[PDB]
């Protein structure tokens, strides 16, 4: 059994991990390879602050709500583990700010200590009028990816830096099963009109007095397009940029100002913050995550493709549930090959 | 009128500030001076985490409840000013842990979003079965004292480094009013069997992923003697040492171990954190705060003395309340002495 995972983001490496640990003992000959065009420093998973928060309203598939819950409980059960720091995992509370009362989210009982904001809190934010507060978790892309790599390496999983042209290419060279975790770039190996880049730009800033996250929502600008501040481990993420269909992997001087202006207004203290760096990333935007099997007619036999992509702006939030599920599907293949 | 403030602690400096700006227009020859033995770098006020939190059970002086109140309100109202980073002001939420279900505090509705810990939160703290969660404030003394200083220097308030031997030494030399803000040392100038040092030892550690304060209460150890973890701006405070009567201004290898074990068990992520610094200090412990007048019979006439000391573990928490009250008592003086 030769498995090939394409993708070295969270989805790729996390899915790689679950399939190993769940099956390395039941399949004496289980060889798992990671093929990636980009690695630990240069993936979308690195631009992300890694704040756990799925969508407010239940999207396309309600099975997604579970995968978040799953990812949350998992991370949560390890917030105090001694390796938490390598994982880049930690707790953070903070604010969700609105202009009008809006229904509680589906995840209200997943996070810790959910509640509405009280008058005095809303006073610190003039432009906003209603909102939530709760404790969540942050999983920073950087450390997590690095930790996944270490686990995977001692696990025998070899890593190769290469660009795949086709599933056929890989199938053609020995793979029984291909786990497809190619993020926003999935289109290149198989057309999918429903996968678009939701371009984002963030600013990293030195402001350690900021201990809470602050997310703003606004229908005039839309999902992920109003100012947000997310204190990270070493730095604070200043963002609020979402542009469907923009493939420009390049920081924009106009986007910069937009980030800076809106976060400064939200939180005046940020005025004297030291700017540490800027990054641009593409959210694998899609109506629903493609987490399903496909059988590609390779020629003699066909090969087994598991897709896992289109995690939107919430891939760190849900990755784990997705990986458990992807492994379930891997399990189903095994039986169907009378070699479980 | 000649004013002399003894003490360059928070109490000292804030009281001089309050008095000045409230009276420099109406008292033409208002010459204020600070006399101190120790300044900004090395006072008790520097050792303080600066976490706003009165005691749980109420104080003798039901006033102290309003003073902390006005302090929180005052600070909370400046948290988003341009100069907040300079004051070392910012918001921080966190836990209070207990063994048994205990009554609510009196300041319950002063802080933002007070509430109880949910079972899932208590699950993160094995050794504790109940507690609260709320959003308080931190005013780090190091920065606060520096800000105060710069205010005062630009208002003409001259500072002198000298150790006062007696109230009369200062009276003898021309001082009309003497503002007595000498902290745990107040007795050296005038006998007070109530004023005592609650020695405290802390540890400054590098752990920027902790964005929550954690305060424990173990009755089999007493107030301030349970482990606590207070994230500051640059560094995290680790503590849990309270010793009534101990005047040893020196770190204790045995007190260190106690800090470090108590805190690692409270939060294991702390085990792989870098120890940046360590300090000792004396909480000016007194059954209640002394804040009142006293006529000094120095000869042909009296000199006025305003005492404002004995703030135990909550000087920062309360300082603004006490300083308003002292400028007030400074007023009474003015009217009686026909000079309003
Ligand atoms: C600005 C910004 C902020 C964000 N903040 C958050 C947040 O707070 N919380 C959150 O949960 N999510 C957040 N996200 C989104 C989250 O980062 C993504 O949904 C998540 O990283 C998706 O994982 P992935 O599929 O990108 O792995 P990817 O990043 O897609 O992995 C891509 C790897 O696949 C490789 N690859 C692709 N195609 C091929 C090919 N044909 N051949 C070889 N290799 C290939 C690439 O080279 C790359 O190495 C944010 C995103 C952005 C842009
Ligand atoms: C470990 C520890 C942690 C603490 N944490 C907190 C906290 O989290 N939150 C909080 O609110 N509080 C905390 N505190 C305590 C709080 O910081 C103090 O109660 C507060 O600083 C009291 O103000 P003050 O009396 O110290 O002014 P001080 O700092 O004590 O005043 C000192 C000045 O008086 C001068 N002086 C005294 N006598 C004379 C003299 N005869 N002649 C000349 N000068 C004289 C000294 O030289 C010095 O300049 C903590 C204390 C400790 C020890
Ligand atoms: N996930 C985020 C952070 C974020 C940003 C804005 C929001 O309204 C929100 O709910 C979350 C992002 O993709 O950037
Ligand atoms: N003021 C603190 C911090 C602290 C420590 C323990 C407590 O129970 C509390 O209310 C506050 C201290 O003096 O140390």
Curated annotation (Swiss-Prot), chains A, B:
Effect of residue 331 to V: Leads to the formation of ubiquitinated protein aggregates; impairs targeting to peroxisomes; results in abnormal peroxisomal morphology; decreases cell viability
Induction, as annotated: Induced in cells following exposure to etoposide.
Any one Gene Ontology molecular-function term assigned to this protein's record: identical protein binding
Region (Active site lid that may open upon substrate/product migration in and out of the active site and close to increase the hydrophobicity of the active site, to make the hydride transfer reaction more efficient): 216-228
Cofactor(s) required for function per UniProt: FAD
pH dependence per the entry: Optimum pH is 9.5-10.
Documented EC number(s): 1.4.3.3
Any one GO CC term of the record: cytosol
Binding site for FAD: 8-11, 37-38, 43-45, 49-51, 163-164, 182, 283, 312-313, 315-317
Temperature and activity: Optimum temperature is 45 degrees Celsius.
Protein's name in the database: D-amino-acid oxidase
Organism: Homo sapiens (Human)
Top-level taxonomy: Eukaryota, Metazoa, Chordata, Craniata, Vertebrata
């Amino acid at each position: 059994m030769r498995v090939v995972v394409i993708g070295a983001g969270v989805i790729g490496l996390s899915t790689a991990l679950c399939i190993h640990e769940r099956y390395h003992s039941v399949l004496q000959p289980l060889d798992i390879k990671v093929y990636a065009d980009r690695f630990t420093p240069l993936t979308t998973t690195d631009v992300a602050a890694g704040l756990w928060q799925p969508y407010l309203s239940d999207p396309n598939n309600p099975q997604e709500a579970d995968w978040s819950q799953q990812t949350f409980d998992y991370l949560l059960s390890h917030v105090h583990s001694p390796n938490a720091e390598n994982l880049g995992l930690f707790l953070i509370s903070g604010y969700n700010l609105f202009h009008e009362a809006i229904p509680d989210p589906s995840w209200k009982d997943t996070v810790l200590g959910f509640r509405k904001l009280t008058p005095r809190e809303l006073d610190m934010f003039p432009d906003y009028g209603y909102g939530w507060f709760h404790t969540s978790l942050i999983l920073e892309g950087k450390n997590y990816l690095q930790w996944l790599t270490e686990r995977l390496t001692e696990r025998g999983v070899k890593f190769f830096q290469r660009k795949v042209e086709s599933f056929e290419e890989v199938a053609r060279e020995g793979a029984d099963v291909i786990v497809n975790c190619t993020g926003v770039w999935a289109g290149a190996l198989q057309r999918d009109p429903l996968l678009q880049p939701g371009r984002g730009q963030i600013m990293k800033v030195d402001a350690p007095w900021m201990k809470h996250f602050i997310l703003t929502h606004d229908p005039e600008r839309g999902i992920y397009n109003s100012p947000y501040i997310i204190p990270g481990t070493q730095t604070v993420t200043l963002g609020g940029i979402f542009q469907l269909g923009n493939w420009s992997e390049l920081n924009n001087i106009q986007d910069h100002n937009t980030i800076w202006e809106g976060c400064c207004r939200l939180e005046p203290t940020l005025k004297n913050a030291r700017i540490i760096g800027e990054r641009t990333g593409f959210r694998p935007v899609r109506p629903q995550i493609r987490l399903e099997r496909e059988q590609l007619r390779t020629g003699p036999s066909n090969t087994e493709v598991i897709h896992n992509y289109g995690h939107g702006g919430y891939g760190l939030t849900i990755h784990w549930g997705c990986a458990l599920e992807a492994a379930k599907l891997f399990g189903r293949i095994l039986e169907e090959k009378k070699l479980s």
